[model samples]
Target: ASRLLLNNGAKMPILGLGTWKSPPGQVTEAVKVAIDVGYRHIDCAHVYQNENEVGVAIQEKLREQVVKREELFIVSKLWCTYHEKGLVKGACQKTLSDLKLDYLDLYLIHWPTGFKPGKEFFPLDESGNVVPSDTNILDTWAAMEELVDEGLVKAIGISNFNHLQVEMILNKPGLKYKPAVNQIECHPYLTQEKLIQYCQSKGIVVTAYSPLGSPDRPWAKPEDPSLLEDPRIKAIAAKHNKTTAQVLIRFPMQRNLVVIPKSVTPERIAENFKVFDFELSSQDMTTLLSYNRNWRVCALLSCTSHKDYPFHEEF
Candidate 1:
């Protein structure tokens, strides 16, 4: 598999195993299976709340010599509540401790948004109205840079960030590190060309999540348009003799962005890892790019007020 070299000279695999919705009970087994089947890159986050199981699998892999710690690219993110300066290191430390690893290959600010320590995923009071906080993302980012200085993380980046938020961080004075990557929603339905282009121009690698349009996402509504079932994606899948998921993963890989598609089933896990075996033609690439409808599956309404909360028109 080819690697996307970060601006800081770390090599991140083009494809990684995403563990977002993997249930706690199943994640350990899933991680073990993924490692045994040639997946060296694992994307995790404290918010997933399954790091303990994922860590167990990592320890098992290390003990069994499935792969050296150095060979596997392990990535994780810091959750919203830990955005405060005093809490940032502790938050990352907790994940590192839970994963049983000395350091993370990459650490990200989970979202550009922040919250109070005890706040729920949806920031609402008992009355059901939205609550707000004052912890700025840039403040948290500064603490994240300190993690790199302390050698707790190899590279630092952001996820679920818009161009404006990214610019805010980039423009900070005396910043020791710019985000090495921006992990966001990218699929045939949401190609994110301009966003990807901007990140690339700034030397920040973009990692695509929900690459298969997350058909199996736990929260997927019945009314959602399945990108995997779309005619264009199906056509490309047929042309490449691949599954629609493979076509989706291959699209961003061809575009030089990292992709992490999650699945716990053995066959699907193996299938998602097999994308490196094929290539998409330029015509197919252009056709896939043209299918961008700017559809986003992970947009959180609580995070923004912009009419297009996730996709800014300026992008």
Candidate 2:
């Protein structure tokens, strides 16, 4: 498998399996098949509500001696509800316990804004609006740095953060750890050229989420443009005798960005990892780039009212 060295000297597999929307019962087997298919990196999250199932699959592989714990790069995120300084450690503990792991290879602050901490994940009010919290992202970040010092995680990062938010962390006074990566929504439709270039220039590796345009997203409408069926992408895929999914995944890899495409099917999971077999020509890469319309499939619309909503920025 291809790998990239992080700013922290940790080697992360460039290709990873995404667990969001992968329900509990189905995710265990999905993860098991992924590991058997040579996936060492598994991108998971607390809000995914399937970490326990993912852990079961991971333990199965470890027990079968198919993969070593040290060889696997497991990632999870700190949910927005736990952004408060005093709550950060407890949230991480819960995630570690649920994942049945001692430490994660990488932990990320799930989003730039914070939600009111409570039993309710979204914490909706009577007006059906999401309850907001006053916790500052930097304060949560300070607690995250403590996780590294306490050896709870090898690296820490942020997701859904725009360039300015990233700059905030980089320019924070007495910064103990620079963000190792900035995970964002990216694909040909939302090529994310500037953000990727900016983070790369700053030594912060960029990870592309929803790389296939997240067709499975629940809110997707039938009439919306589909990256999988896009004529230009399909043409490029035909040029290389590859699936459109393969073409989409390779776009980020060619640009030196980490990409996590979610799939529960054994065939797609294995096929997504077979990207190293072929390379996208320079022209093919540029043609794919031309399809960008700044579209985002994972737009967190519920959080649009938050002060730190990321998509408002030009990046």
Candidate 3:
């Protein structure tokens, strides 16, 4: 329950609840319980299609004074299909309408790649490749910048962007704003050491999604390595007298990255929040790195050929 100062002077909670696939009839209670158990940040996205439920939970907490609106950091993302310049505002508006929030504390471009705009979520042509949007990213970004001017969002950032993609944004001649945070899949398996240091050097905060290795992710295969079950993480947990879950959640905080680990079961949700009690030793940190395999859970392989697809080069 500490905050990192954003480049825009806003306070972002170091930990949050990710509602990517939290499921229906469960996220409302999950959000409510998260607030009850000392969590102040809630990460959502338009593509997740569950913000309305998250909203009800938040409204209930606000009605009961569980936490003030200003005390919480609410974040949402723009879906790839809405990256078109003319669609950005409407997409952000729809999320705000769903979440019932007057403004978002943070809004991010969900992915570096763009898709054609329309009713389809993943529009594909007869040839089977995803139709690319003709709108330039700069045009989309220029519209995003206006959201800040219009006070629709306090800070804006990107997700799933590699080092070069971020540099391209920063290097824009007319770029009025730099990304405050770059969220990516990060855990011991894919620590992304060089990329994180680069973002930090530019004063951008890094947020680690799948901080627990995303064991419950739908794409998880039978042969996938589980970070929570790794002997090294288990040993570190034993040393700290904490659960492997706690160790996983706390691991990125040591590297100065915000972490969002998701769970819907109230007991497990509270368990994930019990992470601020101890710090990992330097030796333990180095020992944890021995397990790094540069593994990625959400590879976005279908779009690997897309021109804007990030993660192609070394970070």
Candidate 4:
């Protein structure tokens, strides 16, 4: 597997296993299976609420000598409520405690938005109305930099952040560290060419989530179409003798972006990991790039009213 080295010299696998919506009881088993199937990188977050189980699987893998801590790359995100300086440290410490790990390979701010310290995951008020707090994301980013100095995290980055949000952090005063990566939704439908280009130009690697358009997402309507079954994607898959999911994964990788495709089923996971074997031709790449529909699976409706909703610009 190829690896991308961060500005801080931390190595991240170009491909990783995404744990979003990995169903409560199945995540631990899924982690073990993925690791056994040659996955050296795992993407996790506090919002998923499955760290304990995933941690157990990681411990088992280490105990059996399947992979050493140094051989694997683990990434997790700090939740919205933890953006404040007073709360960021404890939030990360809690994550480390729950995962039963000494330190994280990479830690990221989950979103560009922020919430009140004691709010729920979605940050709703008593009347069930969304409340956006005044906590600036760059302030939180500074706290994240402190984590690196404390030796609790090797590198720090952001997720679900646009180019503008990244620029805010980069241009902030007294910034000692720049984000190493920006994890965002990317697939055939949401190619994110400008966003990816901006990040790369700034020496920030991009990580793609929902790479296969998140077909198994429970929120997906039955009437909604699936990207993997689209005729255009199918044709590209046929040309390469690969699944559409493989085609989608290969597209971003060919562009030098890291991609994480989530799956719990053994066969699907194995199939998703087989993407590095082939390359897409220039004409095929042009065909695939034309399929961008700007579809976003995890739209931040809560932050829509904010001045910086991210989708306002191309980034």
RMSD, one per candidate, in order: 2.0, 1.1, 1.2, 1.5
List the candidates' TM-scores in order.
0.94, 0.98, 0.97, 0.96
Residue pairs of candidate 2 with colliding backbone atoms: none
Q: How should the candidates be ordered by lDDT, best one leading?
A: 2, 3, 4, 1
lDDT of 2 by residue, 1-315 (tens): 388889899998899999999999799999999999998899999999999999999988999999999999999999989998999999999989988899999999999989999887888767666788998878989999999999999999999999999999999999999999999998888888899989999999899999998889986887898999888889989989999999999989999988899999988998988888899999998888988898888777787888888889998
- Deviation of model 1 at 105, angstroms: 0.7
Query: Each prediction's Cα lDDT score?
Result: 0.86, 0.91, 0.90, 0.86
On the 0 to 100 scale, the lDDT of residue 166 in model 1 is 87
Q: Residues 118-164, candidate 3: write the lDDT tens digits.
A: 88878887767788887666777788898898999999999998898
- Deviating ranges (above 4 Å) for candidate 4: 125-129
Best by lDDT: 2
Candidate 3 TM-score over all chains jointly: 0.97
Of candidate 3, the 10-residue stretch with the lowest lDDT total is: 132-141
